[PDB]
């Protein structure tokens, strides 16, 4: 009877809630489909294309994974800080040692300054666990699963008193070929569901989006699931009179069509909350055939997460709330003045995975077999789009434009989306010339 | 049956559901376990044999209906089934033999069914090289072929087709001068050609069961295949039947009677025990106990049965409840099953919990010693010549088969009409017959 | 090692109570007391298991070097065993690996 | 040896082979001598015989000996012991009675156990009491029957008394040694001791710290809270009025656990069996148990899906809950397709009508179960340990993950894959009319209803609830058994 009432009576409409880069007017606009638009899917073997290989795991392999995880990073962290040799987490000694391991809590609760523990690697400490003493550590940022190199003293071999916590090391950023500097400015929109009010099935915001897509004629519109929110009240009590599979095609249409004039490439990103799709991270692309030869040049389906190249501009793509997770379980030495987020995100660029925090949020199934091949970062992203139930924002970090457009929708009220403007400048100088020149988070 | 004769050579590259993978084996075995029985109770040249044999070959769906070039229903069943059941029977050199034994008794039957003609085509095609000779070369060299042949009576070189093979492949026969040789070629009939097939078939099969083990370590790791590797003949039957639920209406004062004409050896012993001695060891209160529900006892009755049968043993009416009521109530009812509701299979009673002095459970045909058994069976009034067969069996280890032989005699028939593998079952047939 | 091999109780002293026993002669002499005993047990227990001997002979059949054989690591002993052999048999052998 | 100076992996395997080989060869032989082989391992072979006459057993051992050594030239089997009682719990883990012969007929009964250590020191007295109590009758010489009957006996009473209050208050005092200060314990709310310790400190004088041992029991607050959060101190128990002892807990989470670990192996006794012996706790108790544990023992349908969850769906019109456990409902004549009428008598709607919602809920009920299986919940096998952790250790045993609490127990998946694969197959068969009919005897009872209810539409309707699952099991939960991989 009322549905979306409050949503559509919104007055903040169009309001810019944050900017970044170089101030821009309100006249954001790209050339539509004009010129060359090079959308190349990147990562490890082309980031998965089919449904899967399975949905049955062999403990004997998850193990193998988690170990490589640590070994690999380690192997390279060891080459960077040039340490000479890690020490078994079980071998005692009076002199200071450099262990290798992954944090982890000692119980089922919230990791904390007391309960931290390090579980070494197989290759050196054949998986031994030794709790950690931090009293003697100045600056530290820890989270369960955090591959870490620590130096401290373990004399009894039943406790290590940390003395130093090496700083995480990220991957080099993408090396632009000469061709990528010859591309012109592009403007990427970006938005993530829910795409409807939690009290209606109107998808109103969806539409508003569309319109907005049109008006501004963006070059690329990367849209993050959930299209059909597994959590939307009506959906979980199965009151809908339509089959999920459909409903979803429905919206998929409205949007492909609703924006045929725009000339904007559409890049969809699946979500674990999309009731109709494979509840397994990493997820496979979406599935749809209803596409004219026309729309096939305009839409593209990609996994979750992903490393996509928008004009030699390496974007990072993940639908999972990696930030409201990592951040729910992280410990630090400072609270006075430090940027919680800028930190969590910092680990992300150094951990080299799209979800290092392990074990993973209580409701977020993962198949590590796949996770080893399809959820690693290729190179430090030039831009990172990390949606989240956490307030909007955009922080430059370790040379990466980390952007969280917030939710297009939030409960009964208006959300936001955001846009970026790109163009890789002149070849030489002090290297890092952020191809992402500006961005804006806007209500809708 | 048709182009259904196949040298299980070259491995299946398909893939199946753990439901087909598991059913192909249970079944593929049921067959091979029926090739075993028939060869024990009959002979390799009888209709009953040929009949029932192809009958199951039939019922298990392993020779029948066609289809579009690729997917030939039975063709497929038999191909996989065999290979899959190569895993299981590759281990014990006592299974490898038994397998080969029964998978060769099978190629034999699928050959005993084809006419001197269809078997010919299958060879030309099969491995690679074999040739038939026209009636020209056939009769031209006829006399010389019959001279080289065995004690082969008469001068009759029948219509029975004759083949020309490389002298080398017929070593087994020219070495004894049992075939005609010419410019490096041997001439033999069907009988002998076949035996050579079967011969090279065993040797190759064995060879493989060998290379099946070697690479077995790379799967024993898998959880879905433990029930095959380890249990295709444990407590769990070729494919038992009689489980729980089911119906029937038994009065009590009749069991005694049924004891003579219905239950098999095993239970017969137990009732007497419980009636004579007014009690029964642990091992026993279970074999019979269950079996009784399976024939259809009621919760009420079971208690009744034992209780009053434990009070003649001069026990404390209250101590029963306190000590036996409990277990007995469980049995019938709820969870914690697989050994508290699963009326013992025969293969079970035969391979677990043998009995000691004081115990009267287990299978007689298996567990009781020759003489004693002899003494037992005579009380049942089984023809002394009859008893002569049974024990001949018991000596072979075909334990229930014997039970079968006993079914027939106590019931008067030439063939019970089914292959036994569980007491209650043997209980029911004895009831169908009434 | 002592309750089993030597069939006798052997109390222990936690690094916690140490200091507090330096506060009075008696106690200090207990700490000392115990300390010894142990080193004795370490002797005894070494005796019960005819260790050193065992070791000799082993090391004499192998033809290696006593210490090693005491440290631990079966591979070594044998390693040698054969080493010697093959050596006596005009056989070139496996360069050690690393 | 991987890192030897004289390595040559082949030479080894070869040997290992002959090894495992020469073992069966032997195992068969024994069975071939109509003697039951109760265990084996690399070069050993336990053999139940049934003699009381030891003079006969060796004469027998040796008989074996001969035959076996007669076959080879060097290798040889050797007599090696005799047990006068044996409790084979599991791999390389047994309890038994060893024989040491005195002279000419008599001997000695030495108690030898291993792999039977309990780590947690927090088992109340009544447990340890009742615990040993059994372990003894078990190393008693009396008969299996005699042992167990007494064990039933005793236990039976345990309970009774437990209910009439004949058990000393202290006999329930559990005791744990904190290794963190109350506000540092994560699992907080769920750990009994740290709870009392917490109550205590913040409440009065003396404060608990590291190394200190704490005392607590479990009571009935009328708070319904999780057991964990219902931990009180012995003191505050007797001196308070409104609370009472929680018989339930101990009986179930204390006594049984122990006894169990020891009796599960006993043929004839089973988890539940004990549990009932201790009270009217059947149902819920079995619940406490597993689905898996029994994976030592092809099946039938009724039982293959017993443990799986019945599909439920409320009627989009009257609201009442509909329960679908199969294609049909009822027996013989009045057998209607469960999807025909709403369990609600006064409702007149045909669920078949709402094929969409059904196809929905299922989907939802199936995300649920795929998530669970995916949650990862690993649980220690040792009943006295039972550490529930989502963290897969890199420290592996031969069987699997190495429990990190008690360093001697493996973690076993809480919701197995097979436990799942069967919950989907259950949904699949609740709507496979196709097969629920070819399951009927006469082609008449068949047609009768095939024509009375299963109109091609209805059939389609079903093919849909069925295509629901199919897709799932399609490329998913390896229902697929790539034969190519298996032999290639
Ligand atoms: S073998 Fe099977 S049938 Fe023959 S007695 Fe034993 S149980 Fe009854
Ligand atoms: Zn209704
Ligand atoms: Zn454990």
Element (H, E) at A97: strand A97-102
CA pair distance D108, B94, nearest whole angstrom: 39
- Which residues of chain D does B282 touch, with a Cβ-Cβ cutoff of 8 Å? 144-145, 148, 268
Pick B15's closest partner by Cβ from D153, D297, D482: D482
Environment class of A232 (CB within 10 Å of its CB; exposed 0-12, middle 13-18, buried 19+): buried
Q: Which two structure tokens, joined as six digits, stand for D104?
A: 């000419």
* Residue whose CA is at the smallest distance from ligand 1 atom 6: B363
Residues within a 6 A CB radius of ligand 1: B 264-266, 346, 349, 363, 365, 399-400, 403, 420, 423, 426
- The answer to whether D411 and A139 have CB atoms below 8 angstroms apart is no
Instruction: Classify the C-alpha dihedral D368-D373-D375-D380 as positive or negative.
Output: positive
Q: Which two structure tokens, joined as six digits, stand for D214?
A: 């704490």
Give bridge partners of residue A440 from the DSSP assignment.
Answer: A19, A419
- The answer to whether A376 and A73 have CB atoms below 8 angstroms apart is no
For β-strands A299-301 and A265-269, DSSP reports them as parallel
CA pair distance B324, B329, nearest whole angstrom: 9
Q: D190: which DSSP letter? A: G
How many other CB atoms sit within 10 Å of the CB of residue B153? 7
Environment class of B251 (CB within 10 Å of its CB; exposed 0-12, middle 13-18, buried 19+): exposed
Interface size C-D, in CB pairs within 8 Å, comes to 14
- Which residues of chain D does C78 touch, with a Cβ-Cβ cutoff of 8 Å? 6
Q: Cα A415 vs. chain centroid, distance in angstroms?
A: 19
- The answer to whether B391 and B399 have CB atoms below 8 angstroms apart is no
- Backbone φ and ψ for A250, nearest 5 degrees, come out as -45, -70
Q: Which two structure tokens, joined as six digits, stand for A224?
A: 């993050």
- Which residues of chain D does B229 touch, with a Cβ-Cβ cutoff of 8 Å? none
Alpha-helix runs per DSSP H in A187-333: 204-216, 233-236, 244-257, 295-298, 322-326
Q: Which two structure tokens, joined as six digits, stand for B228?
A: 């095959």
- Backbone φ and ψ for A413, nearest 5 degrees, come out as -125, 170
Tokens 């004769």 sit at which residue? B5
Question: What's B202's domain CATH number?
Answer: 1.20.930.80
Q: How far is the CA of B231 from the centre of ligand 2 (A)?
A: 47
CA pair distance D20, D41, nearest whole angstrom: 9
- The answer to whether D272 and D396 have CB atoms below 8 angstroms apart is no
- The answer to whether A398 and A306 have CB atoms below 8 angstroms apart is no
- The answer to whether B104 and B199 have CB atoms below 8 angstroms apart is no
Interface test with C, best of D1, D2, D3, D5 (most C CBs within 10 A): D5
Q: CB–CB of D374 and A51 under 8 A?
A: no
Closest by Cα among B174, B111, B114, B119 to B145: B174
- The answer to whether D313 and D357 have CB atoms below 8 angstroms apart is yes
Element (H, E) at D369: helix D355-375
- The answer to whether A307 and A377 have CB atoms below 8 angstroms apart is yes
> What SS3 string covers chain B?
CCCCCCCCCCCCCCEEEHHHHHHHHHHHHHHHHHHHHHHHHCCCCCHHHHHHHHHHHHHCCCCCCCCCCCCCHHHHHHHHHHHHHHHHHHCCHHHHHHHHHHCHHHHHHHHHCCCCCHHHHHHHHCCCCCEECCHHHHHHCHHHHHHHCCCCCCCCCCCCCCEEEEHHHHHHHHCCCCCEECCCEEEECHHHHHHHHHHHHHHHHHHHHHHHHCCCCCCCCCCCCHHHHCCCCCCCCCCCCCCCCCCCCCCCCCHHHHHHHCCCHHHHHHHHHHHHCCCCCHHHHHHHHHHHHHCCCCHHHHHHHHHHHHCCCCCCHHHHHHHHHHHHHHHHCCCCCCCCCCCCCHHHHHHCCCCCCCCCCCCHHHHCCHHHHHHHHHHCCCCHHHHHHHHHHHCCCCHHHHHHHHHHHHHCCCCCCCCCCCHHHHHHHHHHCC
CA pair distance A228, B178, nearest whole angstrom: 82
Q: Is B363 annotated as a binding residue?
A: yes
CA pair distance D231, D190, nearest whole angstrom: 10
Give chains near B: 3+ CB pairs under 8 A. Answer: D
For β-strands D411-413 and B131-132, DSSP reports them as unpaired
Distances (CA, A) of A413 to A44, A336, A406, A410, C25: 39, 33, 13, 5, 79
Closest by Cα among B330, A245, C2, A243 to D274: B330
CA pair distance A381, A379, nearest whole angstrom: 6
Ligand nearest to the CA of D313: 2
Total number of residues shown for chain D: 488
Q: Residue A329, CB half-sphere, CA atoms under 13 Å: how many?
A: 25
Q: A274: which DSSP letter? A: B
Q: How far is the CA of D60 from the centre of ligand 3 (A)?
A: 41
Give bridge partners of residue D96 from the DSSP assignment.
Answer: D86, D112
How many other CB atoms sit within 10 Å of the CB of residue D321? 10
- The answer to whether D145 and D138 have CB atoms below 8 angstroms apart is no
Give chains near D: 3+ CB pairs under 8 A. Answer: A, B, C
- The answer to whether B78 and B62 have CB atoms below 8 angstroms apart is yes
Q: A281: which DSSP letter? A: B
- The answer to whether D302 and D312 have CB atoms below 8 angstroms apart is no
CA pair distance D74, A97, nearest whole angstrom: 52
CA pair distance D44, B68, nearest whole angstrom: 55
Chain B contact present for D145, CB below 8 A: yes
Report the SS3 class of residue D284.
helix
- The answer to whether B285 and B326 have CB atoms below 8 angstroms apart is no
Sheet of D93-99, strands arranged across: D83-90, D93-99, D109-114
Q: Angle of helix B18-41 relative to helix B93-102, nearest 10 degrees?
A: 80
* Cβ contacts of B275 within 8 Å, gap of 6 or more: B256, B309
Q: CB–CB of D190 and A108 under 8 A?
A: yes
Distances (CA, A) of B285 to A333, D103, D453: 69, 38, 48
- Which residues of chain D does C85 touch, with a Cβ-Cβ cutoff of 8 Å? none
Report the SS3 class of residue D320.
coil
Q: Which two structure tokens, joined as six digits, stand for B17?
A: 């559901």
Element (H, E) at A6: helix A5-8
- The answer to whether D279 and D159 have CB atoms below 8 angstroms apart is yes
Interface size A-D, in CB pairs within 8 Å, comes to 117
Closest by Cα among D170, D167, D219 to D195: D219
How many other CB atoms sit within 10 Å of the CB of residue B255? 17
- Backbone φ and ψ for A240, nearest 5 degrees, come out as -50, 150
Q: CB–CB of C79 and D1 under 8 A?
A: no
CA pair distance B99, B106, nearest whole angstrom: 11
CA pair distance D27, A335, nearest whole angstrom: 68
Q: Angle of helix B265-276 relative to helix B282-294, nearest 10 degrees?
A: 120
CA pair distance D173, D216, nearest whole angstrom: 5
Give bridge partners of residue B181 from the DSSP assignment.
Answer: B186
Q: How far is the CA of D293 from the centre of ligand 3 (A)?
A: 15
Instruction: Classify the C-alpha dihedral B300-B306-B309-B312 as positive or negative.
Output: negative
Distances (CA, A) of B156 to B141, B146, B178, D14, D463: 13, 8, 16, 56, 65
Chain A: give the shortest CA distance to residue D435, in Å.
25
CA pair distance A62, A48, nearest whole angstrom: 19
Closest by Cα among B72, B427, B108 to B258: B427
| CA-angle at C42, arms to C41 and C47, nearest 5° | 85
> What SS3 string covers A283-320?
ECCCCCCCCCCCHHHHEEECCECEEEEECCCEEEECCC
Closest by Cα among B263, B261, B253, B269 to B291: B263
Tokens 């290729």 sit at which residue? A378
CA pair distance B236, B351, nearest whole angstrom: 11
Pick D475's closest partner by Cβ from A51, A115, A243: A51
Domain residue limits at B39: 7-230
Q: D332: which DSSP letter? A: T
- The answer to whether D214 and D191 have CB atoms below 8 angstroms apart is no
**Protein residues placing their CB within 5 Å of the ion ligand 3:** D 380, 385, 387, 403, 406, 409
CA pair distance B23, B29, nearest whole angstrom: 10
Q: Which two structure tokens, joined as six digits, stand for D164?
A: 């009439």
- The answer to whether A303 and A270 have CB atoms below 8 angstroms apart is yes
| CA-angle at D319, arms to D318 and D320, nearest 5° | 100
């Amino acid at each position: 009877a009322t549905p979306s009432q409050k949503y559509n009576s919104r007055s903040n409409r169009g309001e810019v809630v944050t900017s970044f880069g170089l101030a821009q007017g309100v006249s954001w606009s790209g050339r539509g489909g004009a010129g060359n638009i090079s959308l190349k899917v990147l990562g490890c073997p082309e980031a998965l294309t089919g449904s899967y290989k399975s949905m049955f795991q062999k403990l004997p392999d998850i193990r193998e994974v988690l170990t490589c995880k640590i070994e690999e990073l380690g192997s390279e962290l060891k080459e960077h800080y040039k340490i000479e040799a890690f020490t078994p987490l079980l071998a005692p000694a009076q002199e200071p040692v450099t262990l290798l391991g992954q944090i982890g809590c000692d119980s089922n609760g919230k990791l904390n300054n007391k309960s931290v523990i390090l579980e070494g690697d197989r290759e050196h400490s054949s998986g031994a666990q030794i709790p950690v003493d931090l009293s003697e550590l100045k600056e530290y940022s820890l989270f369960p699963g955090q591959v870490v190199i620590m130096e401290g003293i373990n004399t009894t071999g039943r406790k290590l008193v940390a003395t130093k916590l090496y700083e995480g090391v990220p991957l080099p950023f993408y090396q632009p070929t000469e061709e990528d500097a010859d591309f012109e400015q592009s403007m990427v929109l970006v938005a993530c569901g829910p795409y409807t009010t939690s009290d209606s099935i109107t998808y109103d915001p969806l539409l508003d989006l569309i319109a907005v897509i049109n008006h501004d004629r963006p070059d690329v519109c990367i849209l993050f699931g959930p299209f059909l929110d597994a959590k939307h009240e009506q959906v979980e009590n199965c009151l809908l009179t339509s089959p999920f599979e459909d409903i979803f095609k429905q919206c998929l249409r409205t949007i492909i069509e609703g924006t045929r004039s725009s000339g904007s490439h559409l890049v969809f990103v699946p979500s674990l909350r999309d009731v109709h799709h494979e509840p397994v991270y990493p997820q496979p692309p979406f599935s749809y055939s209803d596409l004219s030869r026309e729309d096939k040049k305009q839409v593209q389906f990609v996994s979750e997460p992903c490393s996509l190249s928008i004009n030699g501009v390496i974007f990072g793509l993940t639908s999972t709330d990696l930030l409201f997770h990592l951040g729910a379980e992280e410990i630090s030495s400072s609270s006075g003045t430090s940027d919680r987020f800028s930190r969590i995100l910092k680990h992300i660029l150094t951990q080299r995975s799209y979800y290092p925090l392990y074990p993973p949020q209580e409701d977020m199934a993962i198949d590590y077999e796949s996770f080893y091949v399809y959820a690693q970062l290729p190179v430090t992203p030039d831009v990172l789009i990390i949606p989240s139930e956490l307030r909007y924002f955009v922080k430059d970090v370790l040379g990466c434009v980390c952007v969280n457009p917030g939710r297009l929708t939030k409960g009964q009220v208006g959300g936001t989306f955001a846009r970026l403007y790109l163009r890789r400048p002149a070849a030489d100088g002090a290297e890092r010339q952020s191809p992402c020149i500006a961005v804006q988070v806007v209500r809708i | 049956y048709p182009h259904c004769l196949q040298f299980y050579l070259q491995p299946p590259s398909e893939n199946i559901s753990l439901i087909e993978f598991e059913n192909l084996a249970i079944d593929r075995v049921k067959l091979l376990k029926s090739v075993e029985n028939l060869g024990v109770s009959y002979v390799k040249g009888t209709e009953q044999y040929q009949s029932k044999l192809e009958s199951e070959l039939r019922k298990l769906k392993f020779s029948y209906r066609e289809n579009l070039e690729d997917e030939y229903e039975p063709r497929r069943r038999d191909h996989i089934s065999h290979f899959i059941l190569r895993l299981a029977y590759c281990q014990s050199e006592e299974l490898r033999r038994w397998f080969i034994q029964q998978e060769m008794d099978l190629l034999r039957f699928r050959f005993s069914i084809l006419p001197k003609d269809k078997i010919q085509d299958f060879l030309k095609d099969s491995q690679l090289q074999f040739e038939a000779i026209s009636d020209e070369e056939k009769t031209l060299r006829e006399q010389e072929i019959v001279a080289s042949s065995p004690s082969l009576s008469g001068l009759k070189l029948g219509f029975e087709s004759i083949y020309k093979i490389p002298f080398a492949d017929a070593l087994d026969l020219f070495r004894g001068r049992k075939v005609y040789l010419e410019d490096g070629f041997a001439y033999v009939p069907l009988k002998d050609i076949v035996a050579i097939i079967l011969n090279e078939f065993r040797a190759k099969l064995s060879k493989a069961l060998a290379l099946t083990a070697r690479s077995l370590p790379a799967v024993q790791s898998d959880e879905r295949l433990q029930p095959l590797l380890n249990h295709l003949s444990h407590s769990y039957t070729g494919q038992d039947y009689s489980t729980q639920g089911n119906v029937g209406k038994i009065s009590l004062d009749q069991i005694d009677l049924l004891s003579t004409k219905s239950f098999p050896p095993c239970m017969r012993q137990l009732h007497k025990a419980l009636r004579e001695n007014h009690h029964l060891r642990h091992g026993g209160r279970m074999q019979y106990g269950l079996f009784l529900k399976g024939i259809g006892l009621t919760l009420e009755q079971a208690l009744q049965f034992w209780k009053q049968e434990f009070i003649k043993g001069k026990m404390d009416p209250d101590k029963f409840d306190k000590g036996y009521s409990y277990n007995i109530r469980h049995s019938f009812g709820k969870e914690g099953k697989r050994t508290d509701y699963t009326p013992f299979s025969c293969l079970k009673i035969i391979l677990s919990n043998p009995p000691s002095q004081g115990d009267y459970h287990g299978c007689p045909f298996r567990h009781s010693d020759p003489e004693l058994l002899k003494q037992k069976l005579q009380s049942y009034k089984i023809s002394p010549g009859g008893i002569s067969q049974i024990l001949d069996l018991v000596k072979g280890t075909h334990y229930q088969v014997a039970c079968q032989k006993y079914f027939e005699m106590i019931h008067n028939v030439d063939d019970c009409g089914f292959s036994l593998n569980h007491p209650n079952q043997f209980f029911c047939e004895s009831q169908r017959i009434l | 090692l002592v309750q089993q091999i030597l069939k006798t109780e052997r109390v222990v002293i936690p690094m916690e109570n140490i200091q507090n026993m330096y506060s009075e002669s008696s106690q200090l002499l207990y700490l000392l007391e115990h300390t010894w005993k142990d080193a004795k047990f370490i002797l005894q227990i070494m005796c019960e298991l005819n260790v050193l001997p065992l070791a000799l002979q082993i090391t004499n059949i192998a033809g290696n070097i006593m210490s090693r054989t005491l440290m631990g690591g079966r591979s070594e002993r044998n390693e040698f065993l054969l080493l010697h052999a093959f050596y006596e048999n005009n056989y070139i052998v496996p360069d050690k690996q690393i | 040896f991987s890192y030897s100076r004289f390595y040559a992996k082949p030479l080894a395997a070869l040997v290992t082979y002959k090894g495992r080989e020469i073992l069966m060869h032997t195992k068969e032989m024994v069975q071939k001598m109509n003697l039951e082989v109760i265990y084996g391992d690399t070069d050993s072979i336990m053999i139940n015989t049934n003699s009381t006459n030891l003079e006969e057993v060796f004469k027998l051992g040796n008989k074996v000996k001969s035959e076996v050594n007669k076959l080879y030239k060097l290798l040889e089997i050797d007599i090696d012991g005799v047990f006068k009682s044996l409790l084979l719990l599991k791999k390389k883990k047994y309890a038994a009675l060893v024989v040491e012969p005195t002279s000419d007929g008599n001997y000695v009964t030495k108690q030898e156990l291993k792999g039977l250590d309990i780590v947690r020191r927090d088992w109340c007295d009544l447990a340890k009491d009742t615990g040993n109590f059994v372990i003894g009758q078990i190393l008693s010489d009396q008969s299996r029957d005699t042992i167990v009957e007494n064990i039933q006996k005793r236990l039976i009473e345990i309970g009774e008394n437990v209910l009439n209050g004949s058990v000393p208050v202290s006999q329930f005092e559990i005791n744990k040694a904190l290794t963190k200060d109350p506000q540092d314990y994560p699992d907080k709310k769920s750990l009994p001791h740290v709870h009392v310790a917490l109550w205590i400190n913040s409440q009065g004088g003396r404060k608990v710290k590291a190394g200190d041992t704490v005392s607590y029991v479990i009571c009935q607050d009328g708070s319904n809270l999780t057991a964990s959060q219902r931990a009180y101190a012995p003191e505050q128990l007797q001196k308070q009025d409104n609370l009472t002892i929680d018989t339930q807990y101990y009986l179930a989470q204390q006594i049984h656990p122990v006894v169990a670990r020891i009796c599960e192996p006993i043929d004839g006794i089973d988890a539940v069996l004990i549990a009932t012996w201790l009270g009217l706790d059947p149902t819920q108790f079995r619940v406490h148990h597993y689905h898996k544990d029994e994976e030592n023992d092809q099946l039938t349908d009724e039982e293959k899906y017993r443990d799986c969850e019945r599909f439920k769906c409320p009627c989009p019109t009257c609201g009442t809950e509909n329960i679908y456990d199969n294609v049909f409902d009822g027996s013989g004549t009045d057998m209607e397709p469960s999807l025909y009428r709403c369990s609600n008598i006064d409702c007149k709607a045909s669920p078949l009508t709402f094929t969409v919602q059904l196809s929905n809920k299922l989907i939802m009920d199936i995300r649920r179960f795929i998530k669970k299986y995916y949650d990862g919940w690993l649980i220690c096998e040792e009943p006295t340990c039972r550490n529930r952790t989502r963290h897969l250790p890199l420290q592996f045993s031969r069987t699997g993950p190495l429990c990190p609490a008690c360093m001697k127990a493996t973690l076993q998946p809480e919701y197995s894959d097979k436990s799942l694969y069967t919950q989907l197959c259950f949904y699949r068969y609740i709507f496979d009319a196709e097969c629920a009919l070819e399951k009927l005897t006469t082609d008449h009872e068949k047609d009768k209803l095939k024509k009375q209810f299963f109109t091609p539409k209805v059939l389609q309707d079903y093919r849909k609830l069925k295509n629901t699952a199919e897709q799932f099991l399609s490329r998913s939960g390896y229902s697929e058994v790539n034969l190519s991989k298996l032999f290639a």
